[PDB]
Design a protein around this ligand. Structure first.
Ligand SMILES: O=c1[nH]c2ccccc2n1CCCN1CCC(n2c(=O)[nH]c3cc(Cl)ccc32)CC1
Ligand SMILES: *[C@@H]1O[C@H](CO)[C@@H](O)[C@H](O)[C@H]1NC(C)=O
Lengths: 127, 380
């Protein structure tokens, strides 16, 4: 078991910015993926972004490319997701998940990840 | 006689291949124009070109001969237009895979360009007009590469306008593709030679070298963008590409001029040039300096051109004009099978998924192994 902990989500005003953080724990993470998935009410779990902590490779979903940016704070293990210009469609619950970096890993498939965090809502409200 | 179906075809070959935007492909994609990451480009988008080309090779080869060449050339023009329209306006990874597929269709259709002249020119103007059709495309390639860098560095044009210019070029290339005469005949249907063993050896070397060179050329620009990112440093891709092409052209001519009994020196020269290509790839990988990376590329391309010209001379020296098409089709098909296998194993997200920084170590080892495999049986 590897314990993951998201932190830093909540209400945000439509069009404005927010930063989520997934304080992974419980093991070494020099050979780990770390990707964020979301689940809006009535929809299926969606891929948001991913980072390969070994080579630093980063992948993004086309719905967030350019708007979101994911980076690793190595000295602290706390992976971060920086959402810029959140839009009304971004209301969701965001999960951070990890998988041991291995052969033939499908980065964008929600069934690939062994560990999941409890999630934290990002209610992108619009007045 | 042989003029009009040669001026029209050479103008098509020129304008289609003059695409100033190709050198700056990676800097265009990964910049603020598309926001695509290096990992996505190298491990999800680019591999699709090999797969689509492999799938579309043989069906296009048969269709060209059944349909008598011109319509396939028209299809290639249409594919150029569609590929560049998507590359300009298409966004996201999901569209770049379609762009790669359409470019794979574009490359597969190149058969119906080079072979068209044979069907409509006499056999007393075949030998030379082949040279005109090759040289026009090569000159267009070098001119486009030089123009790209000239504009980027002395005019300050963003990479989007290079693509606009490339689209404007391929549109005019398509126009000249409607005017060719429809061949009244064809090679096989409107009209196993490998039994020779030496031809098989030369074909194996040709196919392996072509696969390795096509992979390296597909994934070179990403190495330059990682060693000297375009976002904060000067990038010289156009000039380096032009000089590499010119060096390849001079190497090809030099091999054609110098007279040497290749039945004895061909294997030695092929081994030496494979070792040179492996060493140059290792130099292009390890060194952090960008200029050494450009020099390694230049040496790689020149040595590969020498190798491939020797290999092509050895294969084609005994084959009839009729067997050329089929023999080279099979040779490029084997090359594409090898390239697809290695791409799936190494680059694809469904395989090892290596980044560009370590891919060239594998490619250098691959070329060194190609060199070393042929040298065995040394005692006893
Ligand atoms: O580098 C240059 N300069 C050129 C000037 C004129 C014409 C062609 C030129 N090239 C191409 C050689 C390097 N060349 C190698 C492969 C090329 N390539 C892929 O592998 N997949 C592609 C998909 C698209 Cl939509 C466009 C280009 C693609 C890119 C660069
Ligand atoms: C790319 O990302 C930059 C980040 O500032 C953004 O300004 C730009 O609009 C994006 N462009 C596209 C086409 O996604």
């Amino acid at each position: 078991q590897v314990q993951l902990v998201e932190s830093g989500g909540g209400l945000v005003q439509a069009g404005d910015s927010l930063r989520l953080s997934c304080a992974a724990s419980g093991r070494t993470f020099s050979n780990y993926y770390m990707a964020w998935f979301r689940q809006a009410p009535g929809k299926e779990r969606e891929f948001v972004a991913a980072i390969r902590l070994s080579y630093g490779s980063t992948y993004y979903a086309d719905s967030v490319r350019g708007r979101f940016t994911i980076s690793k704070d190595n000295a602290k293990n706390t992976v971060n997701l920086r959402m810029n210009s959140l839009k009304s469609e971004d209301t969701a619950i965001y999960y951070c998940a990890a998988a041991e970096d291995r052969w033939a890993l499908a980065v964008r498939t929600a069934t690939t990840y062994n560990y999941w965090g409890q999630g934290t809502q990002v209610t992108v409200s619009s007045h | 006689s042989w003029i009009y179906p040669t001026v029209i075809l050479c103008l098509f070959g020129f304008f289609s291949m003059m695409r100033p935007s190709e050198p700056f492909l990676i800097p265009y994609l990964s910049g603020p124009d598309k926001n695509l990451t290096s990992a996505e480009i190298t491990n999800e988008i680019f591999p699709v070109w090999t797969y689509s080309y492999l799938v579309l090779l043989l069906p296009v080869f048969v269709l060209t001969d059944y349909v008598r060449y011109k319509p396939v050339i028209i299809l290639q023009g249409i594919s150029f237009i569609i590929t560049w329209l998507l590359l300009l306006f298409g966004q996201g990874v999901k569209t770049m895979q379609v762009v790669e597929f359409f470019y794979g269709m574009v490359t597969a259709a190149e058969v119906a360009y080079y072979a068209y002249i044979y069907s409509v020119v006499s056999p007393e103007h075949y030998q030379r007009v082949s040279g005109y059709c090759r040289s026009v495309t090569l000159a267009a390639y070098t001119a486009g590469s030089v123009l790209a860098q000239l504009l980027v560095s002395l005019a300050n044009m963003s990479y989007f306008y290079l693509n606009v210019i490339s689209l404007a070029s391929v549109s005019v290339a398509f126009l000249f593709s409607l005017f060719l005469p429809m061949p009244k005949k064809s090679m096989f249907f409107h009209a196993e030679c490998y039994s020779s063993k030496r031809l098989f050896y030369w074909s194996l070397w040709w196919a392996f070298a072509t696969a390795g060179f096509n992979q390296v050329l597909n994934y070179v620009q990403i190495l330059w963008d990682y060693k000297a990112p375009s976002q904060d440093s000067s990038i010289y891709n156009g000039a380096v590409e032009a000089i590499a092409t010119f060096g390849g052209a001079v190497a090809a001519f030099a091999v054609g001029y110098v007279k040497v009994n290749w039945d004895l020196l061909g294997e030695l020269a092929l081994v030496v040039f494979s070792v040179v290509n492996a060493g140059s790839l290792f130099l292009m990988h390890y060194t952090a300096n960008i200029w050494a990376c450009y020099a390694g590329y230049l040496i790689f391309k020149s040595s590969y051109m020498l190798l491939i010209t020797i290999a092509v001379f050895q294969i084609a020296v005994n084959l009839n004009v009729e067997r050329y098409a089929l023999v080279f089709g099979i040779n490029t098909f084997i090359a594409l099978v090898i390239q697809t296998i290695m791409t799936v194993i190494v680059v694809d997200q469904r395989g090892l998924n290596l980044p560009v920084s370590i891919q060239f170590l594998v490619y250098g080892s691959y070329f060194a192994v190609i060199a070393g495999i042929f040298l065995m049986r040394s005692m006893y």
